[PDB]
Amino acid sequence: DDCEDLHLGNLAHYPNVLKGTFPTESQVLELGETLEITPELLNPEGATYSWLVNGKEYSTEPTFSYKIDNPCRADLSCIIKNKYGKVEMSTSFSSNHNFSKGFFYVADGTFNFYDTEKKTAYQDCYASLNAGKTLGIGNYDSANIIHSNGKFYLLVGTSTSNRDHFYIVDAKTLYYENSAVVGANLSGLTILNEQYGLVTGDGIRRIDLKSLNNVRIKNERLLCFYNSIIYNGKVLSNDTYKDESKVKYYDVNELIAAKEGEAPAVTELDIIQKQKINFVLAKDGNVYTLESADNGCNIVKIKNDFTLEKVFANFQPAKGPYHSSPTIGMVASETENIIYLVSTDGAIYKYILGDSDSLKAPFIAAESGVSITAPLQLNQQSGELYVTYTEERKDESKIVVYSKDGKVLHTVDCGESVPSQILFNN
Ligand SMILES: [Ca+2]
Numbered sequence: 001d002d003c004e005d006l007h008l009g010n011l012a013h014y015p016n017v018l019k020g021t022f023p024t025e026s027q028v029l030e031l032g033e034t035l036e037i038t039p040e041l042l043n044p045e046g047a048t049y050s051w052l053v054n055g056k057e058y059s060t061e062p063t064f065s066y067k068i069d070n071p072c073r074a075d076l077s078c079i080i081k082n083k084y085g086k087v088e089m090s091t092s093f094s095s096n097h098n099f100s101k102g103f104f105y106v107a108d109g110t111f112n113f114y115d116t117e118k119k120t121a122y123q124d125c126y127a128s129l130n131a132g133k134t135l136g137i138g139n140y141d142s143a144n145i146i147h148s149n150g151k152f153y154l155l156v157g158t159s160t161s162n163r164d165h166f167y168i169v170d171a172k173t174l175y176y177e178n179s180a181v182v183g184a185n186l187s188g189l190t191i192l193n194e195q196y197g198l199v200t201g202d203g204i205r206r207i208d209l210k211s212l213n214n215v216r217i218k219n220e221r222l223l224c225f226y227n228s229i230i231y232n233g234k235v236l237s238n239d240t241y242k243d244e245s246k247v248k249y250y251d252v253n254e255l256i257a258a259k260e261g262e263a264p265a266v267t268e269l270d271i272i273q274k275q276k277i278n279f280v281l282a283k284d285g286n287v288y289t290l291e292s293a294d295n296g297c298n299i300v301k302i303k304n305d306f307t308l309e310k311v312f313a314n315f316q317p318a319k320g321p322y323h324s325s326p327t328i329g330m331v332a333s334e335t336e337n338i339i340y341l342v343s344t345d346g347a348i349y350k351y352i353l354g355d356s357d358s359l360k361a362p363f364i365a366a367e368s369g370v371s372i373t374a375p376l377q378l379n380q381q382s383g384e385l386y387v388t389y390t391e392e393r394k395d396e397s398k399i400v401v402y403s404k405d406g407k408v409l410h411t412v413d414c415g416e417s418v419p420s421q422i423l424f425n426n
């Protein structure tokens with residue numbers, strides 16, 4: 001087979017890459033694996049390489065080595081150049097990861113993933129899966145996310161006007177879908193249904209969850225739904241972080257139909273609030289919130305007909321001092337008649353609907369000089385409670401994952417960056 005058919009003397013002078021020495025199909029690797037591509041040149045003398053990861057030059061080496069140490073997806077090009085010509089091959093690579101095997105946590109202005117099976121944290125999964133895209137959440141900015149319709153709807157509360165404030169991120173994959181401008185200093189987000197949401201902060205804005213156009217329905221300086229919920233065709237809102245205010249509700253259909261400036265009717269419920277507190281849908285099918293009282297708080301049951309049942313809790317609820325400080329929110333179980341809530345000392349109470357005895361002592365005791373600085377989250381499949389703690393004196397935050405029985409299962413070190421929210425991909 002000496003000199004017969006194809007040989008070097010008849011195959012051009014630009015780089016000649018041997019077949020199969022560069023992937024012809026998209027690569028899928030496990031977390032921890034390394035992608036290695038070593039193109040073999042028939043004529044390698046004087047050749048130079050350029051490896052582009054998502055269009056950005058990563059290497060000039062004749063062999064590509066890239067550790068898949070984070071959930072990612074990337075486009076890969078290889079430009080091989082010599083005196084006589086330039087050749088370019090392209091492929092793509094991604095990690096074989098499962099975002100069902102743990103939870104996302106919003107810290108240092110991005111989506112981070114913690115695997116409860118591997119006990120491993122992956123920082124800034126949003127960038128590595130979206131070609132370096134950022135969500136632009138600065139230190140003095142807020143991230144308000146609602147997981148609905150299999151999407152993460154993010155509202156950035158920022159003083160910058162000419163930037164995207166509202167983002168749609170796929171909840172299962174963490175893939176960016178769309179984003180748009182709404183307005184500066186807007187930190188109140190409500191998802192009404194599959195088609196519409198509400199953005200509050202300077203009154204009420206309806207946002208179309210497909211086109212991302214918004215209509216300013218009500219214009220009221222500093223009017224913000226710090227917390228809200230959809231219940232029996234109404235939007236229940238918490239619009240205070242300090243001042244005495246009552247829970248107010250709006251009609252979902254009136255909010256959907258309202259034209260620019262047509263402020264909708266607002267009705268008050270006999271629920272005095274003097275701080276940020278959320279609304280939780282409990283296993284009894286009712287909505288619960290808290291009412292501010294002199295020597296504690298009241299766990300308020302909001303029935304379908306919007307009548308109220310109130311149970312006194314001899315403890316003050318956890319609170320942040322500023323407009324920017326997040327809601328130290330409650331969390332309800334979907335499988336048990338339970339609500340977890342945080343006292344002002346950093347203790348967790350497990351309220352058992354209808355039984356006021358469950359409020360006589362904390363479920364999880366407080367630790368001195370340690371406070372709970374984010375809303376509670378619960379894993380509805382295991383019953384695991386995710387609590388965000390901050391050591392006041394050193395500014396070191398952690399996510400502690402407790403079992404149904406209150407035993408520590410995981411500790412996620414977050415350092416100087418406080419996680420604001422915990423999300424699931426399902
Ligand atoms: Ca190697």
Ligand SMILES: [Ca+2]
Nearest residue numbers: 233251252253
């Ligand atoms: Ca109605």
Ligand SMILES: [Ca+2]
Nearest residue numbers: 355356357358
């Ligand atoms: Ca009892």
Ligand SMILES: [Ca+2]
Nearest residue numbers: 410411412413
């Ligand atoms: Ca850890």
Ligand SMILES: [Cl-]
Nearest residue numbers: 206208213215
């Ligand atoms: Cl609209």
